[PDB]
Design a protein around this ligand. Structure first.
Ligand SMILES: O=c1cc(O)n([C@@H]2O[C@H](COP(=O)(O)O)[C@@H](O)[C@H]2O)c(=O)[nH]1
Ligand SMILES: O=c1cc(O)n([C@@H]2O[C@H](COP(=O)(O)O)[C@@H](O)[C@H]2O)c(=O)[nH]1
Lengths: 218, 219
């Protein structure tokens, strides 16, 4: 996956007008947008097609699928019908649940991103201790795309070690949560950035600034 | 706690609005509590919650298994409650801050959180099962009153009931299609969740009635 400027916009604004306006303001800097439940549950799944129509960007549906296999299949089917290019999936619920998503993605010509360790403090309680094993599970299952935490570069580096250089790794927690763009790109292929851009006084300048700081990495 | 008619909650996971409405309408005399998840919501929109309220006068549990960072969790809960859901399900495995974020919104908005502890499917054994007792204990410490646990593992459902105590509310999926028994499950759970056994039946009303007949002495 070829992500422009190694930068993925996390569009978690919950108003259609604002989400489209801000995305439009930074369109020259990105070609990949992560759309999650905040926007989708506020504005409907039709928002995905609207983004493709307006920007032609790739869309990662960040739904962190975390149900039983039978339900996971339905969620993936509905999500890809709406035009998402990829979907995020929790690994914690186990291999059968991940495989359900992989099956639908294969059928519909899409990608699964396996979420291993999360970026927030609570991830330390249960997820972190399982994360290496979740990553190995991904490798066993043939998963090629992964998500890991900007806020813990030592953990992000470990995840990269496990999945290898051929796998694709994207990483949230940059900016607002404290992660550094350049340090994160030592290990991740692309960074995910939400609030630092979409809540900025000037989102275009925010995006441009981030890219300037990583210019030697592009 | 919510007063669930016949101790039976319909898992409405049909993805077509017309079929979902038909089947729910057919079993409405038996069930006043419906669980609506992402299969139906992602297919038909959050307005489906509105349509169910308008048509049936059933309580709605939004089974969204919220599993994000605290800030995103808050947004998901707000949007879900804005749409009219009585309650939302939340994963415990992302940790206490993520659960607390949901509890705070539910408190502010006058609604309820159901904490998902152990899951019912085979994959749950890999990571969730080993964390489930602690997730439950965490829920108790956080003041969580409502919980979800697995019909497919009676021994685990029993232990989870012990941890949360008799005053907590416990609902349990995995009944029917996944192999769990209605009566056995109601030894521990306040209500059973049933999806395919009802909604794929040639006569969903007869299917619901049959389940209820089988647990009549437990009502
Ligand atoms: O571990 C993770 C996994 C995520 O998907 N995310 C997501 O990435 C985005 C981070 O946005 P922000 O830059 O505003 O912190 C949010 O949409 C969040 O749900 C995360 O923050 N941590
Ligand atoms: O551990 C769990 C938690 C659930 O919410 N569920 C949900 O409960 C329902 C079970 O439906 P069914 O009776 O068709 O197996 C589905 O909506 C599923 O997503 C589950 O099966 N196991």
């Amino acid at each position: 996956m070829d992500v422009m400027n190694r930068l993925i916009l996390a569009m978690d604004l919950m108003n259609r007008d604002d989400a489209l306006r801000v995305t439009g303001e930074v369109r020259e800097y990105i070609d990949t947008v992560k759309i999650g439940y905040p926007l989708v549950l506020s504005e409907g799944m039709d928002i995905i097609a609207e983004f493709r129509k307006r920007f032609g960007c790739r869309i990662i549906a960040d739904f962190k699928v975390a149900d039983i296999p039978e339900t996971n299949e339905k969620i993936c089917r509905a999500t890809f019908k709406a035009g998402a290019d990829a979907i995020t999936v929790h690994g914690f619920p186990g291999a059968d649940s991940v495989r359900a998503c992989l099956n639908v993605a294969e059928e519909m010509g899409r990608e699964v991103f396996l979420l291993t360790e999360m970026s927030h403090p609570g991830a330390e309680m249960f997820i972190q201790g399982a994360a290496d094993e979740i990553a190995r599970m991904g490798v066993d299952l043939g998963v090629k795309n992964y998500v890991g935490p900007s806020t813990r570069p030592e953990r992000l580096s470990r995840l990269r070690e496990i999945i290898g250089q051929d796998s694709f790794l994207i990483s949230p927690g940059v900016g607002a949560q404290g992660g550094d763009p350049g340090e994160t790109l030592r290990f991740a292929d692309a960074i995910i950035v939400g609030r630092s851009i979409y809540l900025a006084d000037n989102p275009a300048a925010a995006a441009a600034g981030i890219i300037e700081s990583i210019k030697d990495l592009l």
